Design a protein around this ligand. Structure first.
Ligand SMILES: C[C@@H]1O[C@@H](O[C@H]2[C@H](O[C@H]3[C@H](O)[C@@H](O)[C@@H](O)O[C@@H]3CO)O[C@H](CO)[C@H](O)[C@@H]2O)[C@@H](O)[C@H](O)[C@@H]1O
Ligand SMILES: C[C@@H]1O[C@@H](O[C@H]2[C@H](O[C@H]3[C@H](O)[C@@H](O)[C@@H](O)O[C@@H]3CO)O[C@H](CO)[C@H](O)[C@@H]2O)[C@@H](O)[C@H](O)[C@@H]1O
Lengths: 306, 303
């Protein structure tokens, strides 16, 4: 059977799988107060994509479609199409289009448009509120607030490129809520075909997160964004499709400088990592450190404490 | 270690010269102009060239602190690295890794966080890479923004690119004209080499995207020589090249049939046997497959 491996890229050489930004650091913390059920960055170790996960970071939280103005406001409805501008199919057994945001928050970026007939183009600052009742990507539409009430044309290809997140109100860092899934069909129905929630089950363990800081674009947002797998690990597993020989892949995080192991962790075959630690901890690592697969173990493997 | 290329399809991959997905494959003549992109440059045995780095999401991004130019809407950014540490202008690269490698006006959002209270802000901004103030190899670039007062000094600031603009139709950007990374103060140095077919009957094969347009009538075509995922693959694998040319077959797995073959040169670009401009027609599941190392005298079947 094809030997299983993880990439040798360093943490800072990799990308967040939940927003199109680089990874910054490794983080572990308690998750008892949350349901940890992200839909992006979800892949089994033998390369089966889950949730809304697709293969490149540059498509995450992007939207494409045609737009129509909401009444006489500055808001626009986007009728979604696929990444390559073909019709979107709501009957596919996924929660929402691949790459759809998987948290409740207000994402700011630019909404851009081209007029096919003459090549004229335009761009406006725009925000999509994923907690809005008008955030219905599974049904095929989302709503943007923009800085125009007149410049976008109907029936023309329009793209949203995400940049960061915003916040409103006296309760600082109250949004985004990275561990709260949107209602992908709004009030019309419940979420479907979700990748499952993940949680540590073994005493003394926590999830290990790959952490980034989302750019902030207004107010006082919570800019923390944790993913379960780097995007490059998703791509690696998808391509290698190495069969899992047990429930858990034991990984060692190694310093090339000394050859020494810094810590070890459990990569569960369903695609998330646990470590033996309790409480919030920004891991202290050398920048050239990397993960190495060492052996196939089970869910009850007792790790060396972090 | 056996050489391989990724099995990802074209639309599963990213452009190595701007943070957007690949869309299609294109071949055409390029004798009449210089093809010398600096992003998406990597040898098959994993040596990064030009300004190439490993993530698609970092391309044409800028980070640093900003200062207003006079009381105008323009801001100078003093560049730092991806993780906010020093950029060393004496490093023998053309410019910071990920710097734009075309002359054009790139529009995006300039964002900032005030460390002390976590307040944040974002403004539409454009960087003109043909401007005399585009001097990333000196450690600074200039942005035109929609504000003349909201950005603070001494605060972490990021430019996220979105697309390109034009003034005047489709005369800019110029995707095959490198900017002057040091402006008027000096010539470009340490460039990845210009590429050209050397075998009669061959043309470059380009991995093509359409940059979003943000104003005016821009030329939105953007061609790279290698997908970003291939750069990262070669970097990681570091498989030795057994000759100067790797023969690839582009395969339809729905049928096992080869659609065309091509040459992947060790120094990191692809040629096909074709004369003229051509938009390739490929199945959605098609991918490239390394088959053998060939000598210098291999004739490709017509694409
Ligand atoms: C925190 C600021 O965010 C952006 O400006 C926003 C502007 O924020 C105001 C605050 O709401 C207010 O409490 C006080 O602090 O003055 C701020 C500036 O007016 O609020 C408007 C809507 O009311 C928008 O949300 C703006 O984005 C940013 O531009 C500022 O630099 C601050 O970081
Ligand atoms: C082509 C337009 O680009 C954006 O508008 C820009 C605006 O363009 C104007 C043209 O300059 C003018 O020739 C005429 O056609 O009206 C256009 C629209 O007002 O020019 C200003 C400053 O010169 C800005 O650059 C605008 O971005 C876009 O908003 C439009 O919808 C058109 O696509």
């Amino acid at each position: 059977s094809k030997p299983f491996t993880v990439p040798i890229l360093t943490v800072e050489e990799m990308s967040n799988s939940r927003f199109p930004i680089p990874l910054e650091k490794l983080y572990t913390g308690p998750s008892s107060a949350f349901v940890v059920q992200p839909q992006n960055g979800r892949c089994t170790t033998d390369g089966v994509l889950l949730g809304t996960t697709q293969l490149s970071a540059v498509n995450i939280c992007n939207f494409r479609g045609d737009v129509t103005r909401v009444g006489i406001s500055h808001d626009y409805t986007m009728n979604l199409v696929s990444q390559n501008w073909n019709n979107y199919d709501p009957t596919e057994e996924i929660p929402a289009p691949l790459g759809t945001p998987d948290f409740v928050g207000k994402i700011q970026g630019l909404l851009t448009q081209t007029t096919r007939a003459d090549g004229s183009t335009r761009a406006h600052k725009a925000t999509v509120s994923t907690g809005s009742v008008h955030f219905t990507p599974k049904l095929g539409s989302v709503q943007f607030t923009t800085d125009t009430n007149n410049d976008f044309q109907t029936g023309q290809n329009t793209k949203f490129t995400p940049v960061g997140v915003i916040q409103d109100g006296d309760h600082h860092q109250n949004e985004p809520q990275q561990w709260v899934l949107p209602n992908y069909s709004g009030t019309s129905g419940h979420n479907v075909h979700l990748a499952p929630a993940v949680a540590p089950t073994f005493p003394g363990e926590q999830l290990l997160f790959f952490r980034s800081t989302m750019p902030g674009c207004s107010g006082y947002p919570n800019m923390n964004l944790d993913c379960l797998l780097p995007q490059e690990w998703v791509s690696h597993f998808y391509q290698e499709a190495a069969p899992a020989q047990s429930d858990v892949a034991l990984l060692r995080f190694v310093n090339p400088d000394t050859g020494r192991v810094l810590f070890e962790c459990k990569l569960h075959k369903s695609g998330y990592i646990t470590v033996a630690h309790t409480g919030p901890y920004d891991l202290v690592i050398p920048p050239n450190g990397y993960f190495r697969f060492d052996s196939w173990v089970n869910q009850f493997y007792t790790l060396a404490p972090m």
